[PDB]
Amino acid sequence: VQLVESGGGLVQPGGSLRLSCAASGFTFRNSAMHWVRQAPGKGLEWVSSIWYSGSNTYYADSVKGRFTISRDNSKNTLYLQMNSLFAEDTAVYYCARFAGGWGAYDVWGQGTLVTVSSDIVLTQSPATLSLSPGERATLSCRASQSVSSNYLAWYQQKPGQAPRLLIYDSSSRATGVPARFSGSGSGTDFTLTISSLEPEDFAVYYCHQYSDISPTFGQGTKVE
Amino acid sequence: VQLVESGGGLVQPGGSLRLSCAASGFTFRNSAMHWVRQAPGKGLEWVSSIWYSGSNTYYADSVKGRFTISRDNSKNTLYLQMNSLFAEDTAVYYCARFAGGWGAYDVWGQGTLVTVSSDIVLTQSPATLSLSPGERATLSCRASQSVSSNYLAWYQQKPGQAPRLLIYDSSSRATGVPARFSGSGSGTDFTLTISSLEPEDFAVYYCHQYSDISPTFGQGTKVE
């Protein structure tokens, strides 16, 4: 009584994969067959299901219109067609027989690793500053590699609005940006200061580098 | 100096949607025009780029071949045809004028939301247990809803291995499990006991409900 799984590997975003399990030692035709995945360092989560070539296929929402479950009863094989793969699809995939009141998932595949992957990293600290108006705000943005030409820029976002430009070229202020907003740093230690805080200033602040053709963003520090 | 965005809305997986920025107030036929996007709760992330007639056109890895950026200079318009849309494409979409050393992303569209759209919750405690052999262990699993037919199983998973069925239908110890393992409880309070810890029992333990059409798993308990 066993399921032999096959497939997986490294792909680039937007690629395709197929998985498979062949069942040995039980009645594939009456079993329900499910798929279940575990992201690295995480727990288990269900992907898709199919019954007795019923067919009556069921899919988790994350994978809808991208993934496709199918079975070949004559070949005792379950499949999972995986299209337009996203980084978020990275995980160990298992096939499992569903026994219901008679075993739950009693037969498991061993697991195959499906990894999706393809650069300057911006790291803001802290994630959160609780300050009061008038107080100073000092946001760090540290780069994994030196930002040439000091092509680093800060934006501000207020909920439901587009982002607003603040500093560009490290320390150059934008069209209509108050002087309490200061940008400084060079190379990889950039730092935005708000010398005293205004009530409107309470928002999320992102940093941005355009020193290459792959533009990147920090995660935002939030100010409260 | 303006970008007037239009388009978007709610679509089902595999749907189609074209966006539009109409340019006013500058020499549009010569500007570098980008598209940027923010998925709800997350931060900014670049999407696409277009510039003069002898320039390249750039797409983020996760969109290539589905989205198509274009432009009608004669009508001062930027487009983004989006095809084969999927949940992970759910986000607010912005157009922006790129200024580089002269200001980076210095003009934006207001943004339009694009949403692509077509459960019992198990909670384990404690999350970690450091014990020595001979001691007894006690692992909880609570169900947000009530598990019908007490259709709740327990699995063991060791370092990098598929999981192993321990208990099912609440209390049924699977063929081959030491009798120091017992599962008990019903409704929403299930609990599994390991009465004399052998060293080989040290691993992670999951729980699972198959009562409904959307199976679910607890987070796991680590026993050390």
Residue numbers in the entry:
A (entry chain B), B (entry chain A): 1 to 118, 124 to 229
Give the article text.
Diabodies are among the smallest of these bispecific antibodies. They are constructed by connecting heavy-chain variable fragments (VH) and light-chain variable fragments (VL) with short “GGGGS” peptide linkers. Therefore, the two VH-linker-VL chains associate to form a dimer with two antigen binding sites, each consisting of the VH and VL fragments from the different chains. In order to investigate the structural flexibility of the Fv interfaces of diabodies, we have determined the crystal structures of 10 mono- and bi-specific diabodies with and without bound antigens.
In monospecific diabodies, two identical VH-VL protein chains form a homo dimer. In order to confirm this, we determined the structures of six additional monospecific- and bi-specific diabodies with amino acid substitutions at position 83. We determined the structures of three monospecific and three bispecific diabodies by substituting the arginine at position 83 with other amino acids. Note that the diabodies we used had substantial sequential diversity in their C”D and EF loops. The second Fv domains of all the diabodies are clustered in a small area, demonstrating that substitution of the positively charged arginine greatly reduces the structural diversity of diabodies. In conclusion, we have found that substitution of the positively charged arginine in the EF loop greatly reduces the ambiguity in predicting diabody structure.
